[PDB]
Every structure is written in structure tokens, then in C-alpha cells.
């Protein structure tokens, strides 16, 4: 139900941020709970209106990484955050890459809502 969608927002959605620098990743990766116990190595924050993002679920089906056919593609502004390797928990550190790019998301439910950030 809601819980997976809620995890998607928390992990991957930040509409009004310009993002795109390391202080952003460093700040948001801890604020959004991806720094507890261990550092998450890679994460994408989508800088897009939530309803616009949900609109991607209504486009044609394509194949997910794992095999399934409930994935959808859209182009959105993101900040990708990658762990620096010097980084060690609990003080996680990240490098930011800002770009507008194609993402792939898995949707499920009625109505269809984003549930996993595929690619
Ligand atoms: O190009 C890629 C490839 C992999 N991931 C990572 C980010 C997500 O945190 C993870 C999948 O997270 P779930 O939403 O599936 O839990 O895959 C990306 O962000 N971008």
C-alpha cells in the first residue's frame, strides 16, 4: 500500500531543490535516513513535482532490471549521489552529479504509484 510509495518519496523525491553539489547529498542522505548504521553507496534524488512523477506511471510498459514489465521511463532533473570511499559510517560522504536524464521507475497499485527507482 502507501508504505512502499512513502519510501519512494523519502528516498528519491525532492521537488523544489536545485541540488547538484556535495553539501546537498551529504545533508540530504542523512536527513532522509539512508545513513543509519551503514552508508548507502548510490542514490538518486528526483527534482520534479510529485504529480508529474506519478504521471510517468501512465506511459507504456517497458522491462525492469529484474525482468518484470511494470517499469516506465521519463526524463527528469536529478541529483545522483555516490559514496566517496574515504567516507565511513556514520559520517557518510558523497559526490554529487547534477543532470537532466532518463530514469526508469516501477509502479504498482490502483491508481498506479511509483514503488522502486529502477534506473
Ligand atoms: O542508475 C541508477 C542505478 C541504480 N540506482 C539505485 C538508486 C536506488 O536507491 C536503488 C534502488 O532503490 P529502490 O527504490 O529500488 O529501493 O538503485 C540509481 O539510483 N540509479
Swiss-Prot record:
It is found in: Secreted. Its EC number is 3.1.27.-. One of its GO terms (molecular function) is RNA nuclease activity. Its main location: secreted. Belongs to the pancreatic ribonuclease family. This is Ribonuclease 4. The modification Pyrrolidone carboxylic acid is found at residue 1. GO terms for cellular component: extracellular space. The chain holds residues 29 to 147 of 147 of the full protein. Cleaves preferentially after uridine bases. Has antimicrobial activity against uropathogenic E.coli (UPEC). Probably contributes to urinary tract sterility. One of its GO terms (biological process) is antibacterial humoral response. Keywords: Antibiotic, Antimicrobial, Disulfide bond, Endonuclease, Hydrolase, Nuclease, Pyrrolidone carboxylic acid, Secreted, Signal. DUMP binds at residues 7, 12, 40, 43-44, 117. The active site is at residues 12, 116. Disulfide bonds join 25-81, 39-92, 57-107, 64-71.
Amino acid at each position: 500500500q502507501d508504505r512502499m510509495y512513502q519510501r519512494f518519496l523519502r528516498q528519491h523525491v525532492d521537488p523544489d531543490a536545485t541540488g547538484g553539489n556535495d553539501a546537498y547529498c551529504n545533508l540530504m542522505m542523512q536527513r532522509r535516513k539512508m545513513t543509519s548504521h551503514y552508508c548507502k553507496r548510490f542514490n538518486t534524488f528526483i527534482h520534479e513535482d510529485i504529480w508529474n512523477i506519478r504521471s510517468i506511471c501512465s506511459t507504456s510498459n517497458i522491462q525492469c532490471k529484474n525482468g518484470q514489465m511494470n517499469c516506465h521511463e521519463g526524463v527528469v532533473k536529478v541529483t545522483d549521489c555516490r559514496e566517496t570511499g574515504s567516507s565511513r559510517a556514520p559520517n557518510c560522504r558523497y559526490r554529487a552529479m547534477a543532470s537532466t536524464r532518463r530514469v526508469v521507475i516501477a509502479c504498482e497499485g490502483n491508481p498506479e504509484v511509483p514503488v522502486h527507482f529502477d534506473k
